[PDB]
Structure 1
Amino acid sequence: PDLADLFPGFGSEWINTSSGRIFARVGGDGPPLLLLHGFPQTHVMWHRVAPKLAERFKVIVADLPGYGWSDMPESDEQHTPYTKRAMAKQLIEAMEQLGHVHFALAGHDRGARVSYRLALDSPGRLSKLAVLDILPTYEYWQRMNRAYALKIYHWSFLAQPAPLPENLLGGDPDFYVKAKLASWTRAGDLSAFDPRAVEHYRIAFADPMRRHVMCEDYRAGAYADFEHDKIDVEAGNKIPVPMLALWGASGIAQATPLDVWRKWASDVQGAPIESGHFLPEEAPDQTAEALVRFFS
Structure 2
Amino acid sequence: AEEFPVPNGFESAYREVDGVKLHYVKGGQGPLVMLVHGFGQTWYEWHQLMPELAKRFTVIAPDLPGLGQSEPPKTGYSGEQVAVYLHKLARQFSPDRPFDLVAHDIGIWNTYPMVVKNQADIARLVYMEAPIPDARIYRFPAFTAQGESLVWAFSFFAADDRLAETLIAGKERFFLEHFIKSHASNTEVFSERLLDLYARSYAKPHSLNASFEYYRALNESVRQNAELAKTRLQMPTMTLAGGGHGGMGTFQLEQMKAYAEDVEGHVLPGCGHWLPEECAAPMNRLVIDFLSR
Q: Normalized against structure 1, the TM-score is what?
A: 0.89
* Equivalence for 2:156: 157
Task: Point out where structure 1 has 5 or more consecutive residues left out of the alignment.
Answer: 75-79
Structure 1 residues 224, 18: CA separation in 2 closer, same or farther (over 3 Å shift)?
Answer: same
| Amino acid across the alignment from 1:145 | P
Structure 1 residues 165, 241: CA separation in 2 closer, same or farther (over 3 Å shift)?
Answer: same
What CA distance in whole angstroms lies between the structure 2 residues aligned with 1:118 and 1:253?
23
| Amino acid across the alignment from 2:67 | Y
- Kindly indicate whether residue 235 of structure 2 is the aligned counterpart of residue 241 of structure 1: yes
- Kindly indicate whether residue 247 of structure 2 is the aligned counterpart of residue 252 of structure 1: yes
Where in structure 2 are the equivalents of 1:120-199 lying within 5 Å? 120-147=116-143, 150-170=149-169, 172-187=171-186, 189=187, 191-193=188-190, 196-199=193-196
Task: Please give the per-residue CA displacement for 1:31-51, whole angstroms capped at 9, x wherever unaligned.
Answer: 100000011101111111111
| Amino acid across the alignment from 1:215 | F
Task: Please give the per-residue CA displacement for 1:83-127, whole angstroms capped at 9, x wherever unaligned.
Answer: 111111111222233244521000000112223232122212111
- Kindly indicate whether residue 103 of structure 2 is the aligned counterpart of residue 107 of structure 1: yes
* Equivalence for 1:77: none
* Equivalence for 2:78: 83
Structure 1 residues 36, 95: CA separation in 2 closer, same or farther (over 3 Å shift)?
Answer: same
Q: Percent identity?
A: 27
- Out of 225, 229, 239, which is 1:229 matched to? 225
Moved more, 103-112 or 48-57: 48-57
* Equivalence for 2:32: 32
Structure 1 residues 255, 280: CA separation in 2 closer, same or farther (over 3 Å shift)?
Answer: closer
Root-mean-square deviation (CA), in Å? 2.1
* Equivalence for 1:216: 213
Task: Please give the per-residue CA displacement for 1:171-200, whole angstroms capped at 9, x wherever unaligned.
Answer: 52221111111111103x4x2136554332
Q: State the SS of the aligned residue for 1:119.
A: helix
| Amino acid across the alignment from 1:193 | F
What CA distance in whole angstroms lies between the structure 2 residues aligned with 1:278 and 1:100?
32
What CA distance in whole angstroms lies between the structure 2 residues aligned with 1:140 and 1:198?
31
Task: Point out where structure 2 has 5 or more consecutive residues left out of the alignment.
Answer: none
Answer yes or no: is the 8 Å Cα contact 2:101–2:126 preserved in 1. yes
Answer yes or no: is the 8 Å Cα contact 1:137–1:225 preserved in 2. yes
What CA distance in whole angstroms lies between the structure 2 residues aligned with 1:2 and 1:33?
22
Q: State the SS of the aligned residue for 2:110.
A: helix
Answer yes or no: is the 8 Å Cα contact 2:142–2:152 preserved in 1. no
Structure 1 residues 140, 198: CA separation in 2 closer, same or farther (over 3 Å shift)?
Answer: farther
Q: State the SS of the aligned residue for 2:19.
A: coil
| Amino acid across the alignment from 1:183 | S
- Kindly indicate whether residue 289 of structure 2 is the aligned counterpart of residue 293 of structure 1: yes
> What's the offset of the Cα at 1:162?
3.4
Q: Number of aligned pairs? A: 286
Q: State the SS of the aligned residue for 1:41.
A: coil
Answer yes or no: is the 8 Å Cα contact 1:31–1:103 preserved in 2. yes
- Kindly indicate whether residue 276 of structure 2 is the aligned counterpart of residue 277 of structure 1: no
Answer yes or no: is the 8 Å Cα contact 1:16–1:97 preserved in 2. no
